């Protein structure tokens, strides 16, 4: 009944070493620790994922190339482009060890769930939902989300993946697009140009997995109240229809007000309400991070979200800790929405929601 918190020092230091997002793993843990929240959770050291574990989703040719690049680095290896490495996914040294750490942590979280050690397991350094079996994508080198769902499938016949990152959870969806055993649900920005340009509402899945993919395309400037209306509308239908035995929950904090992505206008209370709704099902629940590029706001969010998993209520004033200065000028936990318009027209949202109601009527 106490949640598992997947953490070691060596795990956090490796997750700090991915550029374009420096010292973020550390900032999140540092703030969670400063609120004394680790004292109410079970700290479990992540194992490193083996080649075989990693190969349950990914092709060996990809993993082997990823291993080579990690020792050397892009020069003397023009084969990189084939496997998704490039500017978006730098082919820098040490990444196969990061890949393995991340996949291992999500897998370790899933095993804690299977063993009955907990109802909730947390790996905030995970959530790398874009990676394909044989291709890096959107800064994701390894699909830990997929590796965890597959581990969960040993104990739990039906699994629900709910992806609340700003981006469409395309890699996870694609992995399970042809099966009814895993339902993927995704709320995301979907607009011409925006990555990855998939996950329109009409993306419903294929073959035996038709209607077992669900996608909510949302436009910029959505705030807490409206997002939760959309989210619990979709999730109420999904619970009754699909009836999941277990939940994998990606809570990417690039939807938050103040993020470089500057698309959605959410606060961690808005997401927290979506998280409470999934928690009240009292199912085995694997919690994952993901995108989150205003590093302080991301820690504010994921720290707040940990509090709600615990049922605790945190103080507004940020505790003094290693990265205290990053939380200025106000030094508070709460995030204020930007003053931008909400481009989601109500009629367009309602016809999206009714379409999903209708697709979920088919689920047996
Ligand atoms: O949000 C993501 C992946 C991120 C991504 C996908 C496709 C194209 C670009 C990105 N991310 C960035 O460009 C990015 C992320 C963090 C910081 C910056 C920077 F340029 F501001 F540094 C840029 N997954 O949920
Ligand atoms: K999403
Ligand atoms: K599916
Ligand atoms: Zn994202």
Curated annotation (Swiss-Prot):
<keyword id="KW-0156">Chromatin regulator</keyword>
<keyword id="KW-0804">Transcription</keyword>
<dbReference type="GO" id="GO:0006325">
    <property type="term" value="P:chromatin organization"/>
</dbReference>
<comment type="function">
    <text>Histone deacetylase that catalyzes the deacetylation of lysine residues on the N-terminal part of the core histones (H2A, H2B, H3 and H4). Histone deacetylation gives a tag for epigenetic repression and plays an important role in transcriptional regulation, cell cycle progression and developmental events. Histone deacetylases act via the formation of large multiprotein complexes. Also involved in the deacetylation of cohesin complex protein SMC3 regulating release of cohesin complexes from chromatin. May play a role in smooth muscle cell contractility.</text>
</comment>
<keyword id="KW-0539">Nucleus</keyword>
<feature type="binding site">
    <location>
        <position position="88"/>
    </location>
    <ligand>
        <name>substrate</name>
    </ligand>
</feature>
<dbReference type="GO" id="GO:0031507">
    <property type="term" value="P:heterochromatin formation"/>
</dbReference>
<feature type="binding site">
    <location>
        <position position="254"/>
    </location>
    <ligand>
        <name>a divalent metal cation</name>
    </ligand>
</feature>
<keyword id="KW-0597">Phosphoprotein</keyword>
<dbReference type="GO" id="GO:0000228">
    <property type="term" value="C:nuclear chromosome"/>
</dbReference>
<dbReference type="GO" id="GO:0031647">
    <property type="term" value="P:regulation of protein stability"/>
</dbReference>
<keyword id="KW-0158">Chromosome</keyword>
<dbReference type="GO" id="GO:0000118">
    <property type="term" value="C:histone deacetylase complex"/>
</dbReference>
<dbReference type="InterPro" id="IPR050284">
    <property type="entry name" value="HDAC_PDAC"/>
</dbReference>
<protein>
    <recommendedName>
        <fullName>Histone deacetylase 8</fullName>
        <ecNumber>3.5.1.98</ecNumber>
        <ecNumber>3.5.1.-</ecNumber>
    </recommendedName>
</protein>
<dbReference type="GO" id="GO:0141221">
    <property type="term" value="F:histone deacetylase activity, hydrolytic mechanism"/>
</dbReference>
<feature type="binding site">
    <location>
        <position position="138"/>
    </location>
    <ligand>
        <name>substrate</name>
    </ligand>
</feature>
<dbReference type="GO" id="GO:0030544">
    <property type="term" value="F:Hsp70 protein binding"/>
</dbReference>
<keyword id="KW-0991">Intellectual disability</keyword>
<keyword id="KW-0378">Hydrolase</keyword>
<keyword id="KW-0963">Cytoplasm</keyword>
<keyword id="KW-0550">Obesity</keyword>
<dbReference type="InterPro" id="IPR000286">
    <property type="entry name" value="His_deacetylse"/>
</dbReference>
<feature type="binding site">
    <location>
        <position position="167"/>
    </location>
    <ligand>
        <name>a divalent metal cation</name>
    </ligand>
</feature>
<dbReference type="GO" id="GO:0004407">
    <property type="term" value="F:histone deacetylase activity"/>
</dbReference>
<dbReference type="GO" id="GO:0005737">
    <property type="term" value="C:cytoplasm"/>
</dbReference>
<feature type="binding site">
    <location>
        <position position="293"/>
    </location>
    <ligand>
        <name>substrate</name>
    </ligand>
</feature>
<dbReference type="GO" id="GO:0051879">
    <property type="term" value="F:Hsp90 protein binding"/>
</dbReference>
<feature type="modified residue" description="Phosphoserine">
    <location>
        <position position="26"/>
    </location>
</feature>
<dbReference type="GO" id="GO:0032204">
    <property type="term" value="P:regulation of telomere maintenance"/>
</dbReference>
<dbReference type="GO" id="GO:0160009">
    <property type="term" value="F:histone decrotonylase activity"/>
</dbReference>
<dbReference type="GO" id="GO:0046872">
    <property type="term" value="F:metal ion binding"/>
</dbReference>
<dbReference type="GO" id="GO:0031397">
    <property type="term" value="P:negative regulation of protein ubiquitination"/>
</dbReference>
<dbReference type="GO" id="GO:0007064">
    <property type="term" value="P:mitotic sister chromatid cohesion"/>
</dbReference>
<dbReference type="GO" id="GO:0140297">
    <property type="term" value="F:DNA-binding transcription factor binding"/>
</dbReference>
<keyword id="KW-0225">Disease variant</keyword>
<dbReference type="GO" id="GO:0005654">
    <property type="term" value="C:nucleoplasm"/>
</dbReference>
<keyword id="KW-0479">Metal-binding</keyword>
<dbReference type="Pfam" id="PF00850">
    <property type="entry name" value="Hist_deacetyl"/>
</dbReference>
<comment type="similarity">
    <text>Belongs to the histone deacetylase family. HD type 1 subfamily.</text>
</comment>
<dbReference type="InterPro" id="IPR023696">
    <property type="entry name" value="Ureohydrolase_dom_sf"/>
</dbReference>
<dbReference type="GO" id="GO:0000122">
    <property type="term" value="P:negative regulation of transcription by RNA polymerase II"/>
</dbReference>
């Amino acid at each position: 009944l106490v949640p598992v918190y997947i953490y070691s020092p060596e795990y956090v230091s490796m997750c700090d070493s991915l550029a374009k997002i420096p010292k973020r793993a550390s900032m999140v843990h540092s703030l969670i620790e400063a609120y004394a929240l680790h004292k109410q959770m079970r700290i479990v050291k992540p194992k490193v994922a083996s080649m075989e574990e990693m190969a349950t989703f990914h092709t060996d040719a990809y993993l082997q190339h990823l291993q080579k690049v990690s020792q050397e680095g892009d020069d003397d290896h023009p084969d990189s482009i084939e496997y998704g490495l490039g500017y978006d996914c730098p082919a820098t040294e040490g990444i196969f060890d990061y890949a393995a750490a991340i996949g291992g942590a999500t897998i370790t979280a899933a095993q804690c769930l299977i063993d009955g050690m907990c109802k909730v397991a947390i790996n905030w350094s995970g959530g790398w939902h874009h990676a394909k079996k044989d291709e890096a994508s959107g800064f994701c080198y390894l699909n830990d989300a997929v590796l965890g769902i597959l581990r969960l499938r040993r104990k739990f016949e039906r699994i629900l993946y709910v992806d609340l990152d700003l981006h469409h959870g395309d890699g996870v969806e694609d992995a399970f697009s042809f099966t009814s055993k895993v339902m993927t649900v995704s709320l995301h920005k979907f607009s011409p140009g925006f990555f990855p340009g998939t996950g329109d509402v009409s993306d419903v899945g294929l073959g035996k997995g038709r209607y077992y993919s669900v996608n909510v395309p949302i436009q910029d400037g959505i705030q807490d109240e409206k997002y939760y209306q959309i989210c619990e509308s979709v999730l109420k239908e999904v619970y009754q229809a699909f009836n999941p035995k277990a939940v994998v929950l990606q809570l990417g904090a690039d939807t938050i007000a103040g993020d470089p992505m500057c698309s959605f206008n959410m606060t961690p209370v808005g997401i927290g309400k979506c998280l409470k709704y999934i928690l009240q099902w009292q199912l085995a629940t694997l919690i994952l991070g993901g995108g989150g590029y205003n590093l302080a706001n991301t820690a504010r969010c994921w720290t707040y979200l940990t509090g709600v998993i615990l049922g605790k209520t945190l103080s507004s004033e940020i505790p003094d800790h290693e990265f205290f200065t990053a939380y200025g000028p106000d030094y508070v936990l709460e995030i204020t929405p930007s003053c931008r318009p909400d481009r989601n027209e109500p009629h367009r949202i309602q016809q999206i929601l009714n379409y999903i109601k209708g697709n979920l009527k088919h689920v047996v």
